[PDB]
């Protein structure tokens, strides 16, 4: 049965992306310098997320703290103490009214900044890996019990549950159209979900180990993933096949995060070797590197404006590059 | 104008962060691990989602966490505990059919990339049951190498031989590769485990400081 799908995908292999892209001009050397440094967290930082204004952002640390920063001045706006130390994720509402976090308590807490909790979304049977607002009314989460769910904050009950992964789901990302989203789990597979139908439209494979990060292409027609096999791969929704892979024989450490730039030309990845690399999304060549962290980098983020990039590490510091 | 208020708020936040740092530094975090056969809950009952237990010995505050609300697979959430002061390992030494699984888990923990610097306090629990069983299974049927063993206890050298063989089984893999293991025998009614943990943490921190201060 699956061999029919394999043959169908093979039949569409007209030419590799490398052959088509052999003519486009090179990006050239990319050198970036640190502009800011944010300090104050006691323990390792685990996650962060930019706001829509491209000025404010939030970060979570496993000492039991949430902090909101003003990137321009580096001043601390809010410092929120948590109830469970081992937070693992956090997100920022598109309108800036709300901020959410979650971790090993199997609870997703939402805070109102207009600071105290406003809603606790209990019901998951495993630790929370990621969460992302769709609006002030709805949010999407992924859990270590291999399920993703969509919540209604006002009622605080699940509306739909997405199932089909066999291992823990580690990452997810929302399409720009807000009508679709993808996730990756610890089974070397990524799936495309429809928020309204609540069913799996497509499935993708090609990695060898657990997938740790995933992100949507700016156009909404592609995405990338990073896994413990120390490689990154790009997929196309229409072709239903892998387009390009970014790997080098000198690196044997897994990836922790991935992100795109404004025009989708640069793909940025965070590695366990205490460094981040810059890839040419088309030519598939390593164009630059960011160094300066003294421990494994755990998160990444490119501002919606595209003017800057932020990174976090287990060294307990956040840095802004431009 | 508003910048003055912003800087004042930043200073107010920093004043509280500095105070919280001190209380954070004065408490040591421990992770409790083991299978359901072991009476690891009986250890914390002698001091008293994620369960927690707080006890104080010699004016030092200890905080121990028992994570038991997740699936069987643990290669992903175990990483969160990379900075604990020590790991407490509890084994039911009487049930021979589980010793191999315990050894496999111990070896997996000992060689993990993100755990290569955490010392382990090893508890061999339920000694009375072991003595009763041996004084009567034969141990050899599960570990054939036992028949060649010789000791390096109240009325039988046999029980000493068996218990020390079990202990050496762990020490052999412990000494095969910065961090150290501390074995202890313990019964189900031992009111000294807090003292043992206190002394072991003292030794661990002293050893770390000896290099932190460039004294080698």
């Amino acid at each position, epitope marked *: 049965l699956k061999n029919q799908i394999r043959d169908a995908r093979k039949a569409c292999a007209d030419a590799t992306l490398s052959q088509i892209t052999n003519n486009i001009d090179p990006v050239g050397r990319i050198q970036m310098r640190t502009r800011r440094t944010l300090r104050g967290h006691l323990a390792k930082i685990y996650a962060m997320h930019w706001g829509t204004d491209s000025r404010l952002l939030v970060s979570a640390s496993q000492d039991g703290k949430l902090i909101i920063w003003d990137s321009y001045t580096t001043n601390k706006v809010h410092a929120i103490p948590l109830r469970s130390s081992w937070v693992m994720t956090c997100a920022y509402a598109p309108s800036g009214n709300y901020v959410a976090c979650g971790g090993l308590d199997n609870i997703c807490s939402i805070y109102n900044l207009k600071v105290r909790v406003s809603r606790e979304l209990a019901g998951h049977t495993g630790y929370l890996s990621c969460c992302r607002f769709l609006d002030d009314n709805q949010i999407v989460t992924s859990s270590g019990d291999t399920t993703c769910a969509l919540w209604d904050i006002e009622t605080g009950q699940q509306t739909t549950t997405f199932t089909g992964h066999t291992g823990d789901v580690m990452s997810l990302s929302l399409a720009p159209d807000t009508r679709l989203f993808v996730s990756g789990a610890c089974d070397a597979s990524a799936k495309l979900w429809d928020v309204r139908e609540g069913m799996c439209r497509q499935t993708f494979t090609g990695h060898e180990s657990d997938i740790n990060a995933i992100c949507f292409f700016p156009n909404g027609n592609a995405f990338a993933t990073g896994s413990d096999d120390a490689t990154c791969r790009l997929f196309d929704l229409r072709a239903d096949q892998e387009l390009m892979t970014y790997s080098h024989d000198n690196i044997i450490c*897994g990836i922790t995060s991935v992100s795109f730039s404004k025009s989708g030309r640069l793909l940025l990845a965070g590695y366990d070797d205490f460094n981040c690399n810059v890839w040419d999304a088309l030519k598939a060549d390593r164009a630059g590197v960011l160094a300066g962290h003294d421990n494994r980098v755990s998160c990444l983020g490119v501002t919606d404006d595209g003017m800057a990039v932020a990174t976090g590490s287990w060294d307990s510091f956040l840095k802004i590059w431009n | 104008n508003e910048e003055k208020a912003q800087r004042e708020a930043n200073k107010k936040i920093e004043k509280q962060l500095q105070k919280d740092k001190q209380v954070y530094r004065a408490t040591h975090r421990l992770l409790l691990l083991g299978a359901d056969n072991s009476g690891k809950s009986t250890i914390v009952k002698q001091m008293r989602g994620i369960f927690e237990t707080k006890f104080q010995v010699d004016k030092v505050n200890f905080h121990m966490f028992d994570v038991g609300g997740q699936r069987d697979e643990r290669r992903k959430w175990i990483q969160c505990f990379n900075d604990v002061t020590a790991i407490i390992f509890v084994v039911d030494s009487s049930d021979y059919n589980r010793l191999q699984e315990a050894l*496999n888990l111990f070896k997996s923990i000992w060689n993990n990339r993100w755990l290569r610097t955490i010392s382990v306090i090893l508890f061999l629990n339920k000694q009375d049951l072991l003595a009763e069983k041996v004084l009567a299974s034969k141990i050899e049927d599960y570990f054939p190498e036992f028949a060649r063993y010789t000791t390096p206890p109240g009325e039988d050298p046999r029980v000493t031989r068996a218990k020390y063989f079990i202990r050496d089984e762990f020490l052999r893999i412990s000494t095969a590769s910065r961090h150290y293991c501390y074995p202890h025998f313990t019964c189900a009614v031992d009111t000294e485990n807090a003292r043992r943990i206190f002394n072991d943490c003292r030794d661990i921190i002293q050893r770390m400081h000896l290099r932190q201060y460039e004294l080698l």
Partner: nanobody
Amino acid sequence: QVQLQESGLRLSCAASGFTFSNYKMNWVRQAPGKGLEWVSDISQSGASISYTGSVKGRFTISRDNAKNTLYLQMNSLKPEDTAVYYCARCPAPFTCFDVTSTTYAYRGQGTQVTV
């Protein structure tokens, strides 16, 4: 996709979808009415090998990286050996935690051996 297919005494385990030479390998058994148990494992190059005590001196593991195949040699079988045998892979490519878990993504469907 990563695939493992066992057959078969000399058991065989063919592998595909990944570089077989990078990962450590294991054998797992499940006797009727009991949970999974660890049997043996072989390092990446085969220079290190280990067995459970109950089968020491009675079984024999081997691997052939030139064709991505894994073997197990069994003799002097006892009635207690009747079980379903699984071919498992360690999670990471250069380091083995969850091979015995009830659900595991990198082990095969198993083969039946009845004495």
